[PDB]
Amino acid sequence: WKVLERRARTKRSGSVYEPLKSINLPRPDNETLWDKLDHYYRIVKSTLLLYQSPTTGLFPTKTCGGDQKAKIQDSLYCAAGAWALALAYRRIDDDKGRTHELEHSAIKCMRGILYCYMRQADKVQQFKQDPRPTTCLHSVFNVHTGDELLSYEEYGHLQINAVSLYLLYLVEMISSGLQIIYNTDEVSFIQNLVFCVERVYRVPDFGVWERGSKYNNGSTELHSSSVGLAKAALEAINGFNLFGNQGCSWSVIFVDLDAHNRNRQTLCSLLPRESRSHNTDAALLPCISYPAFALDDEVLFSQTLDKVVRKLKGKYGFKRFLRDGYRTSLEDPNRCYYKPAEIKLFDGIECEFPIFFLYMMIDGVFRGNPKQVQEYQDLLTPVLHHTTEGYPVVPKYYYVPADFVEYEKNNPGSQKRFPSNCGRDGKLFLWGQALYIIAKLLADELISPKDIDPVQRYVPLKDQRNVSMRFSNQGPLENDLVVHVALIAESQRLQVFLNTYGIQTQTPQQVEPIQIWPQQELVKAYLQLGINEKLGLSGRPDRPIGCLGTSKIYRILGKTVVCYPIIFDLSDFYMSQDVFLLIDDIKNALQFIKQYWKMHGRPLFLVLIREDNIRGSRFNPILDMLAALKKGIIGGVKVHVDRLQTLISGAVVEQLDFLRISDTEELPEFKSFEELEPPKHSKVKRQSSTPSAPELGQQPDVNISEWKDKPTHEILQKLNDCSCLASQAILLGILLKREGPNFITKEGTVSDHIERVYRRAGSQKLWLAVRYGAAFTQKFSSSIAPHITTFLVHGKQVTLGAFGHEEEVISNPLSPRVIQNIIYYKCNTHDEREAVIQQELVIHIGWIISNNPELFSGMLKIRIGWIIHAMEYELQIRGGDKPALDLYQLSPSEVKQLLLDILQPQQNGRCWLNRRQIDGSLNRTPTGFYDRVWQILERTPNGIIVAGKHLPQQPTLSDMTMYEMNFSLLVEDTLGNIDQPQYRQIVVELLMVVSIVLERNPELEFQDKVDLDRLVKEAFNEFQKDQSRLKEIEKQDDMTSFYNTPPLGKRGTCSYLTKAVMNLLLEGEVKPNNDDPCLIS
Amino acid sequence: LEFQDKVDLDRLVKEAFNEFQKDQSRLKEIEKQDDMTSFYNTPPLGKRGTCSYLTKAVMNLLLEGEVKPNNDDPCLIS
Amino acid sequence: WKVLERRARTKRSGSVYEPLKSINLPRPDNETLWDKLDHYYRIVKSTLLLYQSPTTGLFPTKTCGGDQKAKIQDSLYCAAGAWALALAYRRIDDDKGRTHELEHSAIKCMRGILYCYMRQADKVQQFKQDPRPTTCLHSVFNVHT
Ligand SMILES: Nc1ncnc2c1ncn2[C@@H]1O[C@H](COP(=O)(O)OP(=O)(O)OP(=O)(O)O)[C@@H](O)[C@H]1O
């Protein structure tokens, strides 16, 4: 180092003036880099590269016995290790022809994987349309011929993490510089593979462990690791060029932002756990380590790492997950599936995998924590095995001997475990060996972290500034996005009308170089992208484009393209006839764009103004919204308004060159948006608002319970001579139900008449009539399915059905056709207006949870019918002495407003009965109440019975944990049998009191099963006796006076509840705790 | 829970004795007898010990009075 | 930081399963980045950007006495300061039209230096052939013309 190097003080001491360089610096232990690299090359060639089939380049999973199966993940890891060794050898000019061999080792493995995948193209086509385990790509192929080996009935073959890892590794090696993909057919295949990958967030997967779940009963559940790997692969493949340096504009892969956003939303909420049944697992390590680096949070990552280290760490290695029976002593090697209560026997004897020590060392090296790397190196050193030549071997796992299982269970970690079959000479673990080679290369500073991560998957805390779709320029802790807003008016007349009121707008005739397209044209253009007639490929499926996809600017066939959001188009529903709903939707879209924008450059937003919604009393809200837009801030979001030509100038454009490459003889025509010519008959020059009052009021005089058995001629005459719109619509509904839609009426066919009545009622703003028409037409909105899938993404279940009747649970995402069938074929016994109100409610709640998820904290499942019952009760209570008006005529604006008023966290004021009814209908529970239920369940034998349903104690404890979401679902299902919301709240209050008493008094225990109904009845009796003694009131039935009592206070409900609980508890045995020093008590 | 007014031990002892006498009469069909010769023989822990009657009586007295919720504890609706 | 951020142990102590994010982390001394950047902008405007000739954009070496000389290195360093301040301001979306002004200031200083150098092309030609102090580019130009 400095001062020591010079040592040139020939005479005493003095200042020296001469170059020192660095070659003359003292050198460490005398060993050239060539010797170390040759040693690594030897231990690689003799152990890892020795097992590779030249025909396909696929590494076999077994090194003995002539096994033909070969996994994909192991081959990918071996290729990664070979590529790392090639990068290590790259540092030497005279390589003696060794870098090329390892580089093509990686190349050949990747090409074999690609060939095996491309042998199944019909499987890709089927998975694109209906992704199911029966129609998924195989994960195990023959090691000699590249042929399928195991059928769907014995392996499942549903593994997406392998595909995601393959794509990410391909991106990494191509970015580092390689030649893997040759022609355009491979480009199309990879593009359609990415298309299949886009829809990971809905389909359950078997997971990396190929078991499916802890129970191992052939069940598929969503896994955090798979979602994270898919998100990382999508991030890497966005805008990436597969041809390397020698590439053009027609070799790029385009990724939809909506799928990435959905994956991120589905990941960032389930990440603290692994799945519904797995609280923690060791498979989360690759998701947040060197494979993926898909967690850009640095707090959730720390929490997950701490949880994993606290739970699954062992001295031999890391267990896969708690209660695992993989190759354990107690496992029975003749049955593929497990049994209920069997997994309890696998506690304390779980196997440990040493490869997670290598994973930890790699993560520590990447983060820059030498102490952790050294500690894990010392921990991993004694568990290594050497061959005859001395080459280290990493055992696959360690298993307890069958004789010592009892001793291990009594005191974990005391006994000595035995190495697996692949932990000595003769059998080897290629994945573990490649991991060890990579870890040793990285820990010895032979590989820089940048060399193995060209795409910069991992960034430090000081570099989370400018990454596409990962961080915004402001940073990861700030969001003040500014949205560019351009106003578009249809005709010059509308532009003049807006300009006369201080609003400046541009028309399509004034932006001639700029073409405005709807979403359909963009969808059609993206459909033509993935066309490959040689293999058979349909390209991108016909799906709508979200707000994120419509915020860019595209250049198609040399013409710039701008697309307005899907909010501005209306197809069949009457929700677009309210300007307030449009304003709410545009505000929600602006907030969603601001919250979930991570691209480069300000997003472009187009506003469409239609003459149909500036007419009448609705002109003022539109003018106010336009003034707010012009001011600069709308709904807490800052916006900028300027000319479109200036905005598009100097901005980043999107290139769609695949259209030119298409071999179609005739180029498809796209209809851009056009200026609307003015009428030559009426010549309406955008007149004033003119409120006026050409409306009347009358209630319908006919109900379905009366005009049912009346004859055809009389009902036809009544329809002819009547004028009420709602009464009319009722008569046409009856006519369609009985006489058929094709019946010929006085004014034409029935259906035409009902459509015309719906149209005029919507024009005249008669909500009852339009809702009746929509109910009788069985009309459907395409926005329900995205709302339902967003509901299911957030981990919240939805149930449709009338209050106090049959309901259906949507466990998993499903096609819109089945949703329509369920909604319109399960409410036949009730009025069809329930379906329409359910659609409105589900859309509103979906939008609210998309924008404000905090409003729904504490509730798991959403019941539309119970919320409607609470809606009606709230309308009644605001009615007071005067009866409530109606629920089906208050209009969607007031429906949403008073629904928001219902959704308030607290409603102090009116008596506790109303609050109890509202809370019970909304299905709101205290935080952690399910943990209290679990504690009671452990401390209460024989289970708990309520509302007829009985919940057992043995299988729940033996199969299931404290924090498992399965317990949440089971408790919700058990407690949902109660029909009265107030009774449900009484039950939950009793459960909370029981939990508090049990925790505060550990000595007491329940002798037998507890029946909550008996305790409720005893509380009734005690409260009635108290009231009769206090006021001399004769005993009365029904809960009508018990709910009104405040829960806490003087003679509250809680007091009677705890009195009954203690009376029951003291009836049983009292076991004294010897630990407590309280004597003679 | 707090005591509303002054406590008197004789009343609690009498109530515990009456509860024990009623329990014995129900269990073994034994007529009520004066003096606590049988009450003292009961062990102070286990099945229907004297501790159970004493804690039942004191809890019944406590729940008669007002219950003040502590805002420090995060337990809600309790 | 970690462990301190959660503070969600409502009942004694136990493992929690909920997102924590980083926005809820404790914040240092409360001061918006806009306020500090505005303070820096005022300091720059009142001291450095005040003395700049509109004709050429060359910063004068003297702030008083009506001196006409202007060095090149000082102007380059002033442009460096303006560019650095603009880069610092670039982190905000709503700059109120301030980043563009400093980006200009840098552009104008560079263009003034370039114009002053371009005014002497025969000097460059002579420097190419026989580099001598008598045939070298000038280093001090007029601040106004
Ligand atoms: N009316 C709408 N309002 C808002 N976003 C919409 C609307 N219609 C479609 N989208 C967006 O378009 C995409 C919807 O995709 P698509 O309709 O193909 O099905 P999905 O969301 O994958 O699920 P599902 O199986 O329920 O249809 C999502 O980005 C959704 O946000």
Coordinates of C-alpha atoms and ligand atoms in Angstrom, one line a residue, chain A residues 199 201-202 258 262 542-547 566-567 782-783 785-789 813-816 847, ligand 1:
Chain A
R199 CA -51.8 -14.0 -17.7
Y201 CA -51.8 -13.7 -12.1
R202 CA -55.1 -15.7 -12.6
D258 CA -51.8 -3.9 -17.8
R262 CA -51.9 -6.8 -12.4
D542 CA -58.7 -10.0 -28.5
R543 CA -58.6 -8.2 -25.1
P544 CA -59.3 -4.6 -24.1
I545 CA -56.5 -2.1 -23.4
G546 CA -56.3 -0.4 -20.0
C547 CA -55.5 3.2 -19.2
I566 CA -62.1 3.4 -23.0
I567 CA -64.1 5.5 -20.5
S782 CA -68.3 -6.0 -20.3
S783 CA -66.7 -4.1 -17.4
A785 CA -65.3 -9.3 -15.6
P786 CA -62.3 -7.0 -15.1
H787 CA -64.0 -5.8 -11.9
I788 CA -64.4 -9.4 -10.7
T789 CA -60.8 -10.3 -11.5
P813 CA -61.5 -16.0 -12.0
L814 CA -63.9 -17.1 -14.7
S815 CA -65.1 -16.1 -18.2
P816 CA -67.8 -13.4 -18.5
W847 CA -63.7 1.1 -8.6
Ligands
LIG1 N1 -64.4 -0.8 -18.5 C1 -63.1 -0.9 -18.1 N2 -62.7 0.0 -17.1 C2 -61.4 -0.1 -16.7 N3 -60.4 -0.9 -17.1 C3 -60.9 -1.7 -18.1 C4 -62.2 -1.8 -18.6 N4 -62.3 -2.8 -19.5 C5 -61.1 -3.3 -19.6 N5 -60.2 -2.7 -18.7 C6 -58.8 -3.1 -18.5 O1 -58.5 -4.0 -19.6 C7 -57.9 -5.2 -19.0 C8 -59.0 -6.2 -18.9 O2 -58.5 -7.5 -19.5 P1 -59.6 -8.6 -20.0 O3 -60.9 -8.0 -20.2 O4 -59.0 -9.3 -21.2 O5 -59.6 -9.6 -18.8 P2 -58.8 -9.8 -17.4 O6 -58.7 -8.4 -16.7 O7 -57.5 -10.5 -17.6 O8 -59.8 -10.7 -16.6 P3 -61.2 -11.5 -16.9 O9 -61.0 -13.0 -17.0 O10 -62.1 -11.1 -15.6 O11 -61.8 -10.8 -18.1 C9 -57.4 -4.8 -17.6 O12 -56.3 -3.9 -17.8 C10 -58.6 -3.9 -17.2 O13 -58.0 -2.9 -16.3

